[PDB]
Design an enzyme around this catalytic site. Structure first.
Site, PDB file in Angstrom:
ATOM      1  N   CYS A 116      49.161  12.490  54.147  1.00 32.41           N
ATOM      2  CA  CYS A 116      48.799  11.231  53.503  1.00 32.41           C
ATOM      3  C   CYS A 116      49.382  11.179  52.096  1.00 32.41           C
ATOM      4  CB  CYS A 116      47.288  10.968  53.478  1.00 32.41           C
ATOM      5  SG  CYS A 116      46.250  12.305  52.945  1.00 32.41           S
ATOM      6  N   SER A 117      48.685  11.564  51.010  1.00 29.73           N
ATOM      7  CA  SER A 117      49.234  11.326  49.684  1.00 29.73           C
ATOM      8  C   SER A 117      48.565  12.156  48.598  1.00 29.73           C
ATOM      9  CB  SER A 117      49.134   9.846  49.322  1.00 29.73           C
ATOM     10  OG  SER A 117      47.716   9.456  49.208  1.00 29.73           O
ATOM     11  N   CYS A 118      47.683  12.984  49.015  1.00 30.81           N
ATOM     12  CA  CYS A 118      46.808  13.778  48.160  1.00 30.81           C
ATOM     13  C   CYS A 118      47.533  14.353  46.952  1.00 30.81           C
ATOM     14  CB  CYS A 118      46.077  14.871  49.000  1.00 30.81           C
ATOM     15  SG  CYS A 118      45.388  14.178  50.471  1.00 30.81           S
ATOM     16  N   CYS A 125      51.537  16.096  50.085  1.00 30.03           N
ATOM     17  CA  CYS A 125      50.475  15.873  51.031  1.00 30.03           C
ATOM     18  C   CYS A 125      51.129  15.402  52.305  1.00 30.03           C
ATOM     19  CB  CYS A 125      49.489  14.863  50.506  1.00 30.03           C
ATOM     20  SG  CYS A 125      48.141  14.564  51.704  1.00 30.03           S
TER      21      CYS A 125
HETATM   22 FE   LIG Z   1      46.997  12.713  50.899  1.00 32.51          FE
END
Ligand SMILES: [Fe+3]
Ligand SMILES: [Cl-]
Ligand SMILES: [Cl-]
Ligand SMILES: [Cl-]
Ligand SMILES: [Cl-]
Ligand SMILES: [Mg+2]
Ligand SMILES: [Mg+2]
Lengths: 197, 212
Positions: free
Chosen positions: A104-106, A101
């Protein structure tokens, strides 16, 4: 110039946010404790390993997982928050998939577990999109030069898992035995499943 | 929003801090770290006070140097707190009071967002598309490396979702769109300066147009 803002300790801030909301009756009893147990005990890469081991030993399931990942996951009861629309991407002798991601961090939380610190790092978010071969090499995974690397950037609602190739020397292993070698990093795509001797 | 969070392609970072299959320790490495997510869920699902997309945006709205020096889970503490103040649920005073010191928040939004596009196209698998050469100051789920670039559709989702650029601002006009898995060649995105093969970006229909 360019200095950090003054801030109270993070734990003081975090618990201030809890207590501000809790003290207004906005947080049901046991609510954050329940999510903590979900995050720690239920969302887990053991679940994605189970799915990979079934696909490796059941051609019909493999086909289902690659065509309608959401339905395949649903059979096992592993749909959940940040893992409602699932696509599994297949490694082949000429293709290695890797998930990030960048924004972000998905991550497919219920089947991979919450992301690890390193996956959320600026280093991984910046670099794997542009130089995945070098990133993987640095991390311990050499991708032979005859393999296209394909990076999936998790920018919307699709939540991905890699179906890695099955390594030689696992023929006839049980689903349990196969699950054991499908790690979190194999699901993310940065590791290839390893067979001991 | 062309913020520092749009990190893909940025050069100068060092090694990823991991070797494969290394022990990553427990899920939470401090006793507060479950709070941001749990409290996001309280805000989204129990209070109805904001969307997940508004959480992604409020983290993007951290002051840029503040973003760059802040650990992941702390960014979400700051972000959820900011949304609770902006929505009128909490005050910054009471957060600081309870914290026993400063609790700086994300910056105010400089855009009201935009609606779901009225005119879009249903694309099919194998179709060549370009990412619309547009600049959105508010939230958008398009990393800048693919802006204006051309690739090919490998999937159209079978579900539809609110347009981020709307719902990330709490707007009433986010509609629903499917998203598309768009495969770009590495060279389309980074020229000769990449070691990769392809990159697949999951892009809302409203970010795409037919290729030339
Ligand atoms: Fe994310
Ligand atoms: Cl880590
Ligand atoms: Cl703590
Ligand atoms: Cl070039
Ligand atoms: Cl269009
Ligand atoms: Mg075989
Ligand atoms: Mg930028």
């Amino acid at each position: 110039e360019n200095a950090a803002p003054a801030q109270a300790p993070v734990s003081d801030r975090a618990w201030a946010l809890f207590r501000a909301l809790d003290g207004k009756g906005l947080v049901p009893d046991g609510y954050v404790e329940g999510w903590k147990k979900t995050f720690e005990e239920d969302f887990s890469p053991r679940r994605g390993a189970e799915l990979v081991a079934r696909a490796w030993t059941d051609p019909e399931f493999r086909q289902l997982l690659l065509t309608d990942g959401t339905a395949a996951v649903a059979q096992y009861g592993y749909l959940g928050p940040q893992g409602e629309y699932i696509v599994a991407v297949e490694d082949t002798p000429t293709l290695k998939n890797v998930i990030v991601c960048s924004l972000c961090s998905c991550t497919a939380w219920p089947i991979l577990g919450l992301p690890p610190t390193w996956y959320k790092s600026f280093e991984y978010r910046a670099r794997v999109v542009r130089e995945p071969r070098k990133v993987l090499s640095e991390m311990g995974t050499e991708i032979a030069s005859d393999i296209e690397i394909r990076v999936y950037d998790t920018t919307a609602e699709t939540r991905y898992m890699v179906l890695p190739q099955r390594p030689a020397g696992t023929e006839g292993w049980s689903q349990e035995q196969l699950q054991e070698i499908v790690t979190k990093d194999c699901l993310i795509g940065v590791a290839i499943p390893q067979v001991p001797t | 929003m062309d913020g520092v969070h749009d990190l893909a392609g940025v050069q100068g970072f060092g090694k990823v801090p991991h070797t494969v299959n290394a022990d990553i320790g427990p899920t939470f490495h401090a006793e507060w770290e479950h709070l941001p997510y749990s409290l996001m869920f309280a805000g989204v699902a129990e209070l109805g006070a904001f969307s997940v997309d508004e959480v992604k945006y409020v983290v993007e709205r951290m002051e840029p140097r503040h973003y760059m020096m802040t650990p992941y889970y702390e960014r979400y503490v700051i972000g959820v707190a900011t949304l609770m103040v902006e929505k009128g649920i909490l005050t910054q005073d009471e957060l600081e009071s309870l914290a026993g010191g400063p609790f700086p928040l994300s910056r105010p939004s400089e855009s009201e967002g935009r609606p779901a596009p009225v005119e879009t196209t249903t694309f099919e698998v194998g179709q060549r598309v370009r990412v619309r050469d547009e600049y959105v100051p508010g939230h958008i789920r398009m990393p800048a490396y693919c802006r204006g670039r051309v690739g090919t559709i490998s999937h159209r989702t079978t579900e539809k979702w609110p347009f981020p650029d709307a719902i990330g601002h709490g707007r009433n006009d986010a509609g629903e769109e499917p998203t598309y898995h768009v495969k770009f060649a590495a060279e389309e995105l980074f020229g000769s300066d990449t070691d990769g093969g392809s990159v697949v970006v999951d892009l809302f229909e409203g970010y795409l147009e037919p290729a030339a």
